[PDB]
């Protein structure tokens, strides 16, 4: 076939009941995640090729960056709760990987403050049980598929994208091959 298990995607031995339709995992410590966000815009390009209104979900993971990696999963929980993902993703990625000015939870907080989130509303979210729960939910989603690598995308809790099965001679072809594969997988 044109699409084959083992090539553009792999199939989960343990299908995940009730997982989100399009599920991405990333780490602000992940170098290809940096690319996926800044260079490739994987998410937007998948969204343009999916039917309107369908849910894409994106979660942070703990297993890179030790203490700070976990701080970052909590910060991502804060961004989701406040709905400011678009405001802090680039500055968080660059703070960790480009300028390397993010070395503590306080530095992470600075990024939100600079992006115009009020100090009071940051700290309140950071400390909230709503956020504790959003941290739990990110961990659980990752756990359900024994995630050991990012960036990762899962479709309908069954299928996992295999980016290394795709052309990397050309960034634009990669992206469209990636997006087209997600579309195909969602139509199963």
Ligand X SMILES: O=C(O)c1sc(Cc2ccccc2)nc1-c1ccccc1
Which stretches of the chain bind ligand X, using CB under 6 A? Answer: 32, 35, 151, 163-164, 168, 171, 174
Based on CB atoms, which residue is closest to ligand X, 15 or 149? Answer: 149
Based on CB atoms, which residue is closest to ligand X, 91 or 163? Answer: 163
Q: Closest distance between ligand X and the C-beta of residue 26, in Å?
A: 10
DSSP class per residue in 12-42 = -SS--TT--SEEEEE-TT-HHHHIIIIII-H
Q: Closest distance between ligand X and the C-beta of residue 184, in Å?
A: 18
Based on CB atoms, which residue is closest to ligand X, 106 or 169? Answer: 169
Report the SS3 class of residue 148: coil
Report the SS3 class of residue 113: helix
Q: Closest distance between ligand X and the C-beta of residue 113, in Å?
A: 32
Q: Closest distance between ligand X and the C-beta of residue 10, in Å?
A: 12
**CA 43 – CA 41 distance, rounded (Å):** 6
- CB atoms inside a 10 Å sphere around CB 136: 11
Based on CB atoms, which residue is closest to ligand X, 33 or 117? Answer: 33
Residue whose C-alpha is closest to residue 63's, from 26, 100, 14: 26
């Amino acid at each position: 076939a044109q699409y084959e298990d083992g090539k553009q995607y792999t199939t989960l031995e343990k299908p995940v009941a009730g997982a989100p339709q399009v599920l991405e995992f990333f780490s602000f410590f992940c170098p290809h995640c940096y690319q996926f966000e800044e260079v490739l815009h994987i998410s937007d390009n998948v969204k343009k090729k999916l039917p309107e209104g369908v849910k894409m979900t994106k979660y942070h993971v703990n297993f890179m960056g030790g203490d700070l990696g976990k701080d970052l999963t909590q910060a991502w929980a804060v961004a989701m709760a406040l709905g400011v993902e678009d405001k802090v993703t680039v500055p968080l990625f660059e703070g960790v990987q480009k300028t390397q000015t993010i070395r503590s939870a306080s530095d992470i907080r600075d990024v939100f403050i600079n992006a115009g989130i009020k100090g009071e509303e940051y700290d309140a979210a950071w400390n909230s049980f709503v956020v504790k729960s959003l941290v739990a939910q990110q961990e659980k989603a990752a756990a359900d598929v024994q995630l050991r690598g990012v960036p990762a995308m899962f479709v309908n809790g069954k299928y996992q994208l295999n980016p290394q099965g795709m052309d990397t001679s050309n960034m634009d072809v990669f992206v469209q091959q990636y997006a087209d594969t997600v579309k195909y997988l969602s139509e199963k």
